[PDB]
Design a protein around this ligand. Structure first.
Ligand SMILES: [K+]
Ligand SMILES: [K+]
Ligand SMILES: [K+]
Ligand SMILES: [K+]
Ligand SMILES: [K+]
Ligand SMILES: [K+]
Ligand SMILES: [K+]
Ligand SMILES: [K+]
Ligand SMILES: [K+]
Ligand SMILES: [K+]
Ligand SMILES: [K+]
Ligand SMILES: [K+]
Ligand SMILES: [Mg+2]
Ligand SMILES: [Mg+2]
Ligand SMILES: [Mg+2]
Ligand SMILES: [Mg+2]
Ligand SMILES: [Mg+2]
Ligand SMILES: [Mg+2]
Ligand SMILES: [Mg+2]
Ligand SMILES: [Mg+2]
Ligand SMILES: [Mg+2]
Ligand SMILES: [Mg+2]
Ligand SMILES: [Mg+2]
Lengths: 155, 126, 122, 50
RNA sequence: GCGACCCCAGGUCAGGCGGGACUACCCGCUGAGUUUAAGCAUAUCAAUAAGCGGAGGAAAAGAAACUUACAAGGAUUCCCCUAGUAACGGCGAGCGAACCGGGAACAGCCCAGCCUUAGAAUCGGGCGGCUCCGCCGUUCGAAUUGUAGUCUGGAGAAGCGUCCUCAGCGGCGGACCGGGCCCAAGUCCCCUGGAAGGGGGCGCCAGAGAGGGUGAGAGCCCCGUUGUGCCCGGACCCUGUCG
RNA sequence: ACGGGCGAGAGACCGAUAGCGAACAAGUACCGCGAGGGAAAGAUGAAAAGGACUUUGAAAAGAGAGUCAAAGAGUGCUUGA
RNA sequence: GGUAGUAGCAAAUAUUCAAAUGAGAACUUUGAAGGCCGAAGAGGGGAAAGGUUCCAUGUGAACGGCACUUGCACAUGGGUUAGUCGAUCCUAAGGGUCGGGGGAACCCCGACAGAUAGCGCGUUUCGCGCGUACUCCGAAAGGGAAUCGGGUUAAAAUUCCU
RNA sequence: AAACGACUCUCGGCAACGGAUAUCUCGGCUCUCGCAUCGAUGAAGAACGUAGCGAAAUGCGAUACUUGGUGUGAAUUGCAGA
């Protein structure tokens, strides 16, 4: 060691050359993920490609509590307030999270309004074509049904 | 430009495939063009060379020679013609190998399979 | 004079056995000729006779196996040599029905709340 | 030795059969690269090590 | 002496299961020293090499006895960042995570226990049938020292209302995959050459000028290449429609 | 995740002392009691047309002659420091 | 490459004469002579070890440290015959094991923690009586059922023939 | 009389020795992608055999360089025969 330099602390004393991960497959990984997404979209047609609806939640800790992001799933309290049975929500594209507690009225009300908007914007095909049930949509609505590619409810 | 992902442009792979081709593939690889009259009549461009086919050489020292094919030596990638031969130092006569791509077929030996192949080739050209 | 497989299939077991015996005797005679400086014409027949013997044996074996398979059809506990080979792991696998088995509550869940067909437009 | 096992004798028989020159017609084959029997053995040069 | 049960013994009894092989990844165990510290013992090398086992196409993990202290997130896994940071360390040499935040992907569930007692409603074997990966009938056996069913904390049981939801089959297609067949254009004139595939002239094809072969740098000699058309077979899964 | 298995596509990589040890009957020949160790070795010509025949020699071969565009390409055969 | 056609070819008493073959003979074969091994051999057989080296015919090159017509080299063929000779059977020092006891496991101890194998009599194949936990490996010199002459091949014989 | 010759050395042509150089390549190395399929129904490995003419490699199992089905459609080939 010589001269005025920062004290070196390179962590290269083990057999590090046997644990090097290169990224020569990055374009291949991107292509494979795009192919998987396209196959999934074809499979779930006409359901939206963005996936199931997610709640609006706050960021954790003082650094991000001013931020709003997407949570795992809607709380049981939110589903009850919105009138959506918890056993039915997953089947109609609504994620359910039985763990999330509701501590404030603002978040619960925001998620209830979000669920109401989703219900207003939702079209449900009947289980059997010739049979129409309570939750099914009219033929006019069903005819003009298409798959949505991007995020239908940006947060 | 090649676009099929299951075909290779590698020189090494193409050479290996050609030089390790089995007899059935070698037969197709050993194709020759048909004459102008035969091409007009059958609406076909080229055919695999057969034993009893009539052939006219169009390249090399035997550019004018013609005759009947007498052997298709697939292992050697050459055919043998009736009178296209040469004399050794001994004085005996040996046939000279000619590559099928360098000859022209003037008369085909026709059978059921040959006619079927000719019809199949003509159908695509329409 | 050549042996045709499709003609062998139309013969009975006794005739096939007699032909096999004749072919074996001819092969033995050809071997004797080979060991006694036989001519190339006789030597070339060894391959033909061996091929004929193999063809006759194959036809006999296939007929016997077909008969055994027919006899054991619609029956459980077949002979091991007549059972499907596949692979060991495949043979050990659970059947499709066993794979699809589930509890009553799971059946009720799939009957009551299956994944619905829906779109998001209006 | 005079006393030998059956298996050793059979192995020795195979070794004797393998100790011969190549057929002459092998050299005339199209695209032939074999010049001689590279695995020839002499009882005094290399021992079988059985 | 007979009978019931219990534990155990012998069966080439009827029908099944297991051992072993491979190494790139994966799971469990065991486990150094060379080396660095300018010596060396803690440390480092390394929770590594060697050694002993166990799987698959991935494995492992996985549905909070979690993260945090926020206006709160919400199974597991992986990537970026956190971060060479908090911490650890003859506080020397060195070592060194996690949460938040942004992304890839997303999926949730099954049991034990109180709750049939108007009868084990459960399951295995043999035998006989059937539209045979299973269903039905009959007969033996397992099981009450508990097989089915309900329940799993997100709940749930019971009671009362609401009248909201729930029951298959078969045909023809689409989607996916694996194959088969045909299909463009010069080998025209002159020269050098053993051989034009070289030079010069005149033409042509091109959604085909990727590549290879043939007697020397070949788009048009041959196989192919590009783009259509037709044909065959799997996967019984997804999807549209029809009776 | 994936230096094994089966099957594919590529490369500003190596070009026979290089590149895997191995472009070849290479994990072969060979060595070691054994555990193990482990090579060397690619190029005629377009086509064998692979040199008939004469002569000298015991023979290997030499001198002529012949094939080929070429033997100033004659089977350990492109070139040959 | 120089060294260099140099260092070396020297232990085991020794060769000689005539003829035959051959292109070629100090080195092959025949005969004669002169010597050696001298029965605890330079003779005649086996065990281990080797594996065709055994026998016949032929021979370009290489090899046989000079040479070769030659041969334990090369090439093509041939050759090893058992009721009696051996293995095979028995057990020795010991080895390998069940069960049991240890062990993460590869594995360790080894009849020591245990319902042994089975063996005899008569039979409607069932009954009766005995039954101390290995009926396994381990000797071509230990133990041990049985062959002798005579003859025979290029090469086998107590094996082939009588 | 140090001339001709021999020797040594040196320079050039030619001929030897050796296999460098150049031009090649059915091989190697590296990256990426697809799939998931060994075994008591006896695997991997190991041995012995098998062709008219083979020792090795490759293949195969006394049906032994292959039997049978199907596809393709006139060869295999070093020689001989069918
Ligand atoms: K500095
Ligand atoms: K039953
Ligand atoms: K239960
Ligand atoms: K090497
Ligand atoms: K040359
Ligand atoms: K001689
Ligand atoms: K134990
Ligand atoms: K014991
Ligand atoms: K003995
Ligand atoms: K006698
Ligand atoms: K000179
Ligand atoms: K076949
Ligand atoms: Mg798993
Ligand atoms: Mg920083
Ligand atoms: Mg995160
Ligand atoms: Mg039953
Ligand atoms: Mg040239
Ligand atoms: Mg073309
Ligand atoms: Mg004595
Ligand atoms: Mg001898
Ligand atoms: Mg035990
Ligand atoms: Mg005994
Ligand atoms: Mg080079």
């Amino acid at each position: 060691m010589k001269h005025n330099n920062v004290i070196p602390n390179g962590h290269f004393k083990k057999h590090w050359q046997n644990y090097v991960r290169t990224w020569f497959n990055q374009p291949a990984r991107k292509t494979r993920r795009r192919a998987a997404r396209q196959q999934k979209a074809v499979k779930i047609f006409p359901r939206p490609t963005a996936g199931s609806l997610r709640p609006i939640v706050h960021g954790q800790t003082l650094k991000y509590n001013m931020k709003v992001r997407a949570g795992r799933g809607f709380s049981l309290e939110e589903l009850k307030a919105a009138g959506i049975p918890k056993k039915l929500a997953p089947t109609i594209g609504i994620a359910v999270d039985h763990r999330r507690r509701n501590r404030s009225l603002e978040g619960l009300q925001t998620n209830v309004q979000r669920l109401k908007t989703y219900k207003a914007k939702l079209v449900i095909f009947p289980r059997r074509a010739k049979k129409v049930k309570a939750g099914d949509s009219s033929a006019e609505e069903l005819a003009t049904a298409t798959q949505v590619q991007g995020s239908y409810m940006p947060i | 430009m090649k676009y099929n992902p299951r075909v290779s442009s590698s020189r090494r792979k193409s050479r290996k495939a050609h030089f390790t081709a089995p007899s059935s593939v070698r037969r197709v690889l050993m194709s020759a063009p048909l004459s102008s009259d035969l091409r007009t009549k059958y609406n076909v461009r080229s055919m695999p060379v057969r034993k009893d086919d009539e052939v006219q050489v169009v390249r090399g020292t035997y550019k004018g020679r013609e005759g009947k094919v007498v052997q298709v030596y697939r292992k050697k990638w050459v055919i043998h013609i009736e009178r296209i031969t040469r004399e050794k130092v001994n004085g005996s006569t040996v046939n000279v190998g000619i590559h099928p791509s360098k000859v022209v077929v003037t008369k085909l030996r026709l059978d059921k399979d040959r006619k079927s192949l000719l019809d199949r080739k003509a159908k695509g050209r329409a | 004079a050549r042996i045709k497989v499709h003609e062998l299939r139309n013969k009975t077991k006794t005739e096939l056995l007699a032909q096999l015996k004749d072919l074996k005797a001819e092969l033995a005679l050809l071997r004797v000729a080979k060991v006694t400086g036989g001519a190339p014409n006789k030597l070339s027949k060894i391959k033909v006779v061996r091929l004929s013997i193999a063809q006759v044996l194959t036809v006999i074996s296939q007929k016997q196996k077909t008969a055994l398979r027919e006899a054991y059809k619609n029956k459980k506990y077949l002979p091991l040599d007549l059972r499907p080979k596949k692979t060991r792991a495949i043979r050990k696998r659970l059947t499709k029905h066993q794979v699809s088995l589930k509890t009553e509550r799971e059946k009720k869940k799939e009957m009551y709340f299956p994944i619905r067909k829906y779109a998001i437009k209006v | 030795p005079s006393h030998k096992t059956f298996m050793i004798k059979k192995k020795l028989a195979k070794k004797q059969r393998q100790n011969r020159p190549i057929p002459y017609w092998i050299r005339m084959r199209t695209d032939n690269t074999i010049r001689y029997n590279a695995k020839r053995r002499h009882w005094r040069r290399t021992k079988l090590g059985f």
